Design an enzyme around this catalytic site. Structure first.
Site, PDB file in Angstrom:
ATOM      1  N   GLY A 184       4.945   1.350  13.263  1.00 16.34           N
ATOM      2  CA  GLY A 184       5.287   1.252  14.815  1.00 16.34           C
ATOM      3  C   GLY A 184       6.325   1.680  14.507  1.00 16.34           C
ATOM      4  N   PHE A 237      15.273  -0.938  18.308  1.00 15.55           N
ATOM      5  CA  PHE A 237      15.316  -1.774  18.165  1.00 15.55           C
ATOM      6  C   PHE A 237      14.921  -2.550  16.917  1.00 15.55           C
ATOM      7  CE2 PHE A 237      17.422  -1.059  22.505  1.00 15.55           C
ATOM      8  CZ  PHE A 237      18.772  -0.634  21.618  1.00 15.55           C
ATOM      9  N   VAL A 244       7.278  -1.647  12.931  1.00 17.85           N
ATOM     10  CA  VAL A 244       6.725  -2.245  11.883  1.00 17.85           C
ATOM     11  C   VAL A 244       5.895  -1.912  10.663  1.00 17.85           C
ATOM     12  CG1 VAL A 244       4.360  -3.578  12.162  1.00 17.85           C
ATOM     13  CG2 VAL A 244       6.171  -4.061  14.009  1.00 17.85           C
ATOM     14  N   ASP A 295       6.450  -7.399  28.886  1.00 21.22           N
ATOM     15  CA  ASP A 295       6.509  -5.269  28.367  1.00 21.22           C
ATOM     16  C   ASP A 295       4.601  -5.353  28.504  1.00 21.22           C
ATOM     17  OD1 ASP A 295       7.454  -3.123  27.428  1.00 21.22           O
ATOM     18  OD2 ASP A 295       7.885  -3.778  25.603  1.00 21.22           O
TER      19      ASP A 295
HETATM   20  C1  LIG Z   1      10.011  -3.050  18.509  1.00 22.65           C
HETATM   21  C2  LIG Z   1       9.343  -1.427  18.843  1.00 22.65           C
HETATM   22  S1  LIG Z   1       7.636  -1.847  17.006  1.00 22.65           S
HETATM   23  O1  LIG Z   1       8.145  -0.962  16.538  1.00 22.65           O
HETATM   24  O2  LIG Z   1       8.158  -3.345  16.219  1.00 22.65           O
HETATM   25  N1  LIG Z   1       6.725  -2.197  17.835  1.00 22.65           N
HETATM   26  C3  LIG Z   1       5.162  -3.071  17.647  1.00 22.65           C
HETATM   27  C4  LIG Z   1       4.612  -2.080  17.613  1.00 22.65           C
HETATM   28  C5  LIG Z   1       3.694  -1.927  19.162  1.00 22.65           C
HETATM   29  C6  LIG Z   1       2.880  -3.069  18.969  1.00 22.65           C
HETATM   30  N2  LIG Z   1       1.898  -4.257  18.965  1.00 22.65           N
HETATM   31  N3  LIG Z   1       4.118  -2.231  16.977  1.00 22.65           N
HETATM   32  C7  LIG Z   1       2.723  -3.150  16.404  1.00 22.65           C
HETATM   33  C8  LIG Z   1       2.196  -2.267  15.304  1.00 22.65           C
HETATM   34  C9  LIG Z   1       1.106  -2.519  14.723  1.00 22.65           C
HETATM   35  N4  LIG Z   1       0.404  -2.532  13.563  1.00 22.65           N
HETATM   36  C10 LIG Z   1      -0.881  -2.423  12.889  1.00 22.65           C
HETATM   37  N5  LIG Z   1      -1.712  -2.042  12.380  1.00 22.65           N
HETATM   38  C11 LIG Z   1      -1.716  -0.607  12.349  1.00 22.65           C
HETATM   39  C12 LIG Z   1      -2.749  -0.250  11.919  1.00 22.65           C
HETATM   40  C13 LIG Z   1      -2.675   1.837  12.134  1.00 22.65           C
HETATM   41  C14 LIG Z   1      -1.922   2.109  11.931  1.00 22.65           C
HETATM   42  C15 LIG Z   1      -2.939   3.980  12.149  1.00 22.65           C
HETATM   43  C16 LIG Z   1      -1.412   4.731  12.452  1.00 22.65           C
HETATM   44  C17 LIG Z   1      -1.452   6.140  12.576  1.00 22.65           C
HETATM   45  N6  LIG Z   1      -2.557   6.143  13.850  1.00 22.65           N
HETATM   46  C18 LIG Z   1      -2.315   6.302  15.091  1.00 22.65           C
HETATM   47  C19 LIG Z   1      -3.476   5.468  13.392  1.00 22.65           C
HETATM   48  C20 LIG Z   1      -3.428   4.403  13.296  1.00 22.65           C
HETATM   49  C21 LIG Z   1      -1.069   1.685  12.970  1.00 22.65           C
HETATM   50  C22 LIG Z   1      -1.090   0.497  13.332  1.00 22.65           C
HETATM   51  N7  LIG Z   1      -1.330  -3.924  12.725  1.00 22.65           N
HETATM   52  C23 LIG Z   1      -0.038  -4.805  13.327  1.00 22.65           C
HETATM   53  N8  LIG Z   1       0.492  -6.007  13.361  1.00 22.65           N
HETATM   54  C24 LIG Z   1       0.936  -6.803  14.078  1.00 22.65           C
HETATM   55  C25 LIG Z   1       1.731  -4.889  14.436  1.00 22.65           C
HETATM   56  C26 LIG Z   1       1.029  -4.170  13.769  1.00 22.65           C
HETATM   57  C27 LIG Z   1       2.041  -0.557  14.844  1.00 22.65           C
HETATM   58  N9  LIG Z   1       2.898  -0.146  16.383  1.00 22.65           N
HETATM   59  C28 LIG Z   1       5.624  -0.821  17.916  1.00 22.65           C
END
Ligand SMILES: CCS(=O)(=O)N1CC(CC#N)(n2cc(-c3nc(Nc4ccc(C5CCN(C)CC5)cc4)nc4[nH]ccc34)cn2)C1
Length: 291
Positions: free
Chosen positions: A17, A21, A24, A135
């Site tokens: 993600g 600012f 992840v 949020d």
């Molecule tokens: C300040 C802005 S931020 O960037 O910091 N923000 C925080 C934010 C929003 C929230 N909550 N985030 C957090 C995570 C995150 N993802 C995961 N696992 C994951 C597994 C698989 C996929 C795939 C991608 C491709 N496809 C779409 C299928 C899924 C994505 C993630 N595990 C996590 N544990 C802790 C955090 C986190 C992700 N986005 C965004």
């Protein structure tokens, strides 16, 4: 403990993600070099102010232990112990916003209400710490498996002052205005009750299945007029909400569930339901469809 996640053993795998600012990343922690997959949050466009806010966010997450809150694992004091990165469990199905779109064909109303209930219990837990999330949105909910979601991000979360039931923000940067309660827009006041308003927007999001053109920004902009720009949008949003304009009932959404949304969207702060109220109501609906 600065020795728990040593930067030399924390290996980047994939981006998960990203925003203006923060970001992840999926990383592997292999101290024996021959390890667990974890999620790592770091700042982007960092400042001393943002780093201090990030330290507060880390302390917030470390203090939370609940089935529907993403698990804190630790901190990496990277760059020779001159920077900070937050280490968290990796949740394999990513954000609920993307998961709902990808899997809407196997997600029925009773499943949506399971996700609703779980988000609600996370929020009940947050309120016992006097934390205000500020949020709540499907983009900030993560999916562990088909039966478990967790609140996944706390970057805007604030602790209530000791003698007040609201936190007043002075200079608001990232503001998700189309999830905001009217008193947050007009007075900069954030409370448990404004989180309940935003939860009503989350519930709306769920029952749209994140369909194209049904998001809260898209709908509010269609009602306000898509040509409006800048502060004018806010002026019109305030006028709209104050006089009972509201997001529509999503296609296929039961009236009973829309009624929950509209009770969350009460301009009278004290009349909004509590998260305890909501969790019991939703679980009773689920149980009375079929336990
Ligand atoms: C300040 C802005 S931020 O960037 O910091 N923000 C925080 C934010 C929003 C929230 N909550 N985030 C957090 C995570 C995150 N993802 C995961 N696992 C994951 C597994 C698989 C996929 C795939 C991608 C491709 N496809 C779409 C299928 C899924 C994505 C993630 N595990 C996590 N544990 C802790 C955090 C986190 C992700 N986005 C965004």
């Amino acid at each position: 403990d600065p020795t728990q996640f040593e930067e030399r053993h924390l290996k980047f795998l994939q981006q998960l993600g990203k925003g203006n600012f923060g970001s992840v990343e999926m990383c592997r922690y292999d101290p024996l070099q021959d390890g667990e997959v974890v999620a790592v949050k770091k700042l982007q466009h960092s400042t001393e102010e943002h780093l201090r806010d990030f330290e507060r966010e880390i302390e917030i997450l470390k203090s939370l232990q609940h089935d529907n809150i993403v698990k804190y694992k630790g901190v990496c004091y990277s760059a020779g112990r001159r920077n900070l990165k937050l280490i968290m469990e990796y949740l394999p199905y990513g954000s609920l916003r993307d998961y709902l779109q990808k899997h809407k064909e196997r997600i029925d109303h009773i499943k949506l209400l399971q996700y609703t209930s779980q988000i609600c219990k996370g929020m009940e837990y947050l309120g016992t710490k006097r934390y205000i999330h500020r949020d709540l949105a499907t983009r900030n909910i993560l999916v562990e498996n088909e039966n478990r979601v967790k609140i996944g991000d706390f970057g805007l979360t604030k602790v209530l002052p000791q003698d007040k039931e609201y936190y007043k923000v002075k200079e608001p940067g990232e503001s998700p205005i189309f999830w905001y309660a009217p008193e947050s827009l007009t007075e900069s006041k954030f409370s448990v009750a404004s989180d309940v308003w935003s939860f009503g927007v989350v519930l709306y999001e769920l029952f749209t299945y994140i369909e194209k053109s049904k998001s809260p920004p898209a709908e509010f902009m269609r009602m306000i007029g898509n040509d409006k720009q800048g502060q004018m949008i806010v002026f019109h949003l305030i006028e709209l909400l104050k006089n009972n304009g509201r997001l529509p009932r999503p296609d296929g959404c039961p009236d009973e569930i829309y009624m929950i949304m509209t009770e969350c969207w009460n301009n009278n702060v004290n009349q909004r339901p509590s998260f305890r109220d909501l969790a019991l109501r939703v679980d009773q609906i689920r149980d009375n469809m079929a336990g």
